[PDB]
C-alpha cells in the first residue's frame, strides 16, 4: 500500500509513538519558551508535539520524490493575524522544520536522494508499513 490508504490521523500518531520507543529524536535546545510560528497567539501547550511533527514530515516525504524545509512550513502554516489588518497566509518557524528533517535523517527514516531534499529510506519504508498495518486493522474511518 501507500500510507494514504490507511487512516491518516492514526498513522501520524502511531508513527510518533514508534519514534518515542526508538529513544532519540535529536531534540532542540529550544521548544520550551518558543514563539514557534507567527500564526500562534499562545506558546505551545507541551514539548511533546515534536514527535508528532516528525511523523507527519516522514509521511509527507514518503508521498513526494524528495523535499526539504519549504514543504513542511506551508503545511504547518495557516492564517497569520496581522493585528487590525486583513489575515493572510504565511510560513512560520523554519528552525524546527529543519531540525526535524535533520533528526529523521539521523535515525535514517529519510535520507538525501534525487529531486532535492530528503526522500524515504527503505528502513523508514519498513517502519511506516508496520504501523500502517496496525492502523489498517484498527479502523477505516
Amino acid at each position: 500500500v501507500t500510507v494514504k490508504d490507511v487512516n491518516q490521523q492514526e498513522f501520524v500518531r502511531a508513527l510518533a509513538a514508534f519514534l518515542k520507543k526508538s529513544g532519540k529524536l535529536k531534540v532542540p535546545e529550544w521548544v520550551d519558551t518558543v514563539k514557534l510560528a507567527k500564526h500562534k497567539e499562545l506558546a505551545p501547550y507541551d514539548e511533546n508535539w515534536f514527535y508528532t511533527r516528525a511523523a507527519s514530515t516522514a509521511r509527507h516525504l514518503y508521498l513526494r520524490g524528495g523535499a526539504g524545509v519549504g514543504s513542511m512550513t506551508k503545511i504547518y502554516g495557516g492564517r497569520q493575524r496581522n493585528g487590525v489588518m486583513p489575515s493572510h497566509f504565511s510560513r512560520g518557524s523554519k528552525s524546527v522544520a529543519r531540525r526535524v528533517l535533520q533528526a529523521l535523517e539521523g535515525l535514517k527514516m529519510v535520507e538525501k536522494d534525487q529531486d532535492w531534499g530528503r526522500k524515504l529510506t527503505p528502513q523508514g519504508q519498513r517502519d511506516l508499513d508496520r504501523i500502517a498495518g496496525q492502523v489498517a486493522a484498527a479502523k477505516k474511518k
Partner: protein, 137 residues
C-alpha cells in the same frame, strides 16, 4: 471534584479558578498570556488545570522562575525590557514595579526633551501616524 487546594497569591492578586492557570495569573502587570504559559512549562506544572486547584508549593516554584528568568533558561529575547535604560541588565518587570518604570521613562525623555517624551506629555500622538480625525471622538 476536588476543591480543596484553593486561594493562591501571585503578586498582590488573589488567584482562583476562573480560567486555565496561565490566563488566571495575568491579573498582574508584566505577565502576559505567553509569559505565564512558559513559566508553568518550565516549572513542570500542568497549565490546563484551575488555580483553585494546585497548592502553595507550585505557586512559589512559579514565582522563583519568573523573577530569575535567565537562571532557569527563559531567554533574554522573551523579556519585556531587554538591556533596559535603568539597569545594565535584562530584567523582567512585574506588578507595581512596571508602572514605576513607565513613569520613569516618560519623565526621563521630557528632561532630555526627546520627541517621544514631549508628544506624550502634551497629549499629541507619539507615533507619527494620523491623528487627523482619530485619537478622539
Amino acid at each position: 471534584p476536588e476543591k480543596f487546594q484553593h486561594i493562591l497569591r501571585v503578586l498582590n492578586t488573589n488567584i482562583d479558578g476562573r480560567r486555565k492557570i496561565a490566563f488566571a495569573i495575568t491579573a498582574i502587570k508584566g505577565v502576559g498570556r505567553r509569559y505565564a504559559h512558559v513559566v508553568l512549562r518550565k516549572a513542570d506544572i500542568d497549565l490546563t488545570k484551575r488555580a483553585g486547584e494546585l497548592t502553595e508549593d507550585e505557586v512559589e516554584r512559579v514565582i522563583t522562575i519568573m523573577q530569575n528568568p535567565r537562571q532557569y533558561k527563559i531567554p533574554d529575547w522573551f523579556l519585556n525590557r531587554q538591556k533596559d535604560v535603568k539597569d545594565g541588565k535584562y530584567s523582567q518587570v512585574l506588578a507595581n514595579g512596571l508602572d514605576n518604570k513607565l513613569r520613569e521613562d516618560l519623565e526621563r525623555l521630557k528632561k532630555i526633551r526627546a520627541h517621544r517624551g514631549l508628544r506624550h506629555f502634551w497629549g499629541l500622538r507619539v507615533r507619527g501616524q494620523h491623528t487627523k480625525t482619530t485619537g478622539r471622538r
